[PDB]
């Protein structure tokens, strides 16, 4: 359906599956995985050459054409913010006789550039904020789609229009050059880029078509971590709450409960960047109950206390609408429910999951969903409250509402350590 380049994964290699059989050469510096993700690094032999099949279609100039792909771009270095912000580098180049298009990146900005035969250039970009508490784009997989017409060169992010550029002074742009996937610029040794599902179409993609392709390429049977990678079993995870973004979970001292504290922030003296720390709070690990975590799986939510693996439980018969979760050494207790069913209540793409507590795997009784609540803590005349790691029945009715509330305190995201994130 109007697709002229379809770079996908097959047999430890990238291949064009558009049906026009272009030649693809992946050099030894490009890392591949079966999840269709490939990585461009700063090593010289980290490149991909696409020699487009010149013997099948018009293949000289396209009036209308689009380019879609998913990208994951590492966080700036805390001590190398200058080179990050100033130095720009090309990631994908496609030109012949000094005319064509190129995708470049300068720091927190990705850039689409056109150049016609006469040398006239035009650009359109997307920029994500780097003063954010919790950024949705930094080091996280997101969906880029670039649409080119006679009038406008638009940039869509995650199915939504983000940028527009008037390109009527632009003439014919030579399109049939080699497509070189390589980092090109004055970059750091530690610079890299992840990409997946790269595609080129000989048409202007409607916003509807783009949002649709976004939803489709977002869909999976499995759940995903904070960065957007598949959620794994036996993998160490920090925990993030979409309801309380600046809040993390800590085992309260000399207690079996999880208190909720405020994330430490960037405390160096640069004004151009800011963030909340992600690698804080307890280290969690998900266990299977009888690899990759899938929807409706039954799991054990464990975490590491000291030199020991502990488990998150709930009390079976609490009378209020909510209750503090009980964090303990692993054990079989007829006093606790220990099995969580992992859930996805959102109909839209998200990296958030929910954690349901049920009586039995066979039974239909829903005990509640794991979240965060503000419990009474102390004081008579002046009542003081505290936020605790909890289970709540209130969430049950709430996840039914449409559209699904992202701000709900039962929406969790798991954060593994990533080379694309340093703090």
């Amino acid at each position, epitope marked *: 359906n109007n697709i002229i380049l379809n770079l996908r994964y097959k047999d430890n290699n990238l291949i064009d599956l558009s049906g026009y059989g272009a030649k693809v050469e992946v050099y030894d510096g490009v890392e591949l995985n079966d999840k269709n993700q490939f990585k461009l690094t700063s090593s010289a032999n980290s490149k991909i050459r696409v020699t487009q099949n010149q013997n099948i279609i018009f293949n000289s100039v396209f009036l209308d054409f689009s380019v879609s792909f998913w990208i994951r771009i590492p966080k700036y270095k805390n001590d190398g913010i200058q080179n990050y912000i100033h130095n720009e580098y090309t990631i994908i180049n496609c030109m012949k006789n000094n005319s064509g298009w190129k995708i470049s990146i300068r720091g927190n900005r990705i850039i689409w550039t056109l150049i016609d035969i006469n040398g006239k250039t035009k650009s359109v970009f997307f920029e994500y904020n780097i003063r954010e508490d919790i950024s949705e784009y930094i080091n996280r997989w997101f969906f880029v789609t670039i649409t080119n017409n006679l009038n406008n060169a638009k940039i869509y992010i995650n199915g939504k229009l983000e940028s527009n550029t008037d390109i009527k002074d632009i003439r014919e742009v030579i399109a049939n050059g080699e497509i070189i996937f390589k980092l090109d610029g004055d970059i750091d040794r530690t610079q890299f880029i992840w990409m997946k599902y790269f595609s080129i179409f000989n048409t202007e993609l409607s916003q509807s078509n783009i949002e649709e392709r976004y939803k489709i390429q977002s869909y999976s049977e499995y759940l995903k971590d904070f960065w957007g990678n598949p959620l794994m079993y036996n993998k160490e995870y920090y925990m993030f709450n979409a309801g309380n973004k600046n809040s993390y979970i800590k085992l309260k001292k*000399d*207690s*079996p*409960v999880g208190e909720i504290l405020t994330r430490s922030k960037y405390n160096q003296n640069s004004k151009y960047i800011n963030y909340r720390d992600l690698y804080i709070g307890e280290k969690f690990i998900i266990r299977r109950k009888s690899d990759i975590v899938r929807k409706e799986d039954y799991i054990y939510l464990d975490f590491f206390n000291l030199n020991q693996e502990w488990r998150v439980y709930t*009390y079976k*018969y*609490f*009378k*209020k609408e909510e*209750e*503090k979760l*009980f964090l303990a050494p692993i054990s079989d207790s007829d*006093e606790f429910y220990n099995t969580i069913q992992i859930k996805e209540y959102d109909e839209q793409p998200t990296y958030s999951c929910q954690l349901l507590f049920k009586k039995d795997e066979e039974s239909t009784d829903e005990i509640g969903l794991i979240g965060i609540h503000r*419990f*009474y*803590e*102390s*004081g*008579i005349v002046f*009542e003081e409250y505290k936020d*605790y790691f909890c289970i709540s029945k209130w969430y049950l009715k709430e996840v039914k509402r449409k559209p699904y509330n992202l701000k709900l305190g039962c929406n969790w995201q798991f954060i593994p350590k990533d080379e694309g994130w340093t703090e």
Partner: nanobody
Amino acid sequence: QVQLVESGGGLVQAGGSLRLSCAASEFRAEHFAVGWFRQAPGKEREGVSCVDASGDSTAYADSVKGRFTISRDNNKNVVYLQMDSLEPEDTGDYYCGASYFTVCAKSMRKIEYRYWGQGTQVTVSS
């Protein structure tokens, strides 16, 4: 600070009765479950009995049924422990604590309970 003042108890001969009282200092105790523990000198302190956030649900140690009866007055912010047929093996300092949870459990694990008071000594003589 935020504590749970205990009272009652003292010297009493074997077979008699006694009544302990927990009052909540600087917090409302109806939100929490509440438990009485005993501590003999040297030994670790064990759970004696406990009660739900409300009344209704109760739990006692197996060596305590059915001589003791725990109860709650949430209006007066006070927990009572009636003790009958006391044995000399009930001697020791009695501490009262509030739980993090609303749920009382026969387990009566020390870590679940906080806001401990200074306690009141009881002694039973043959």
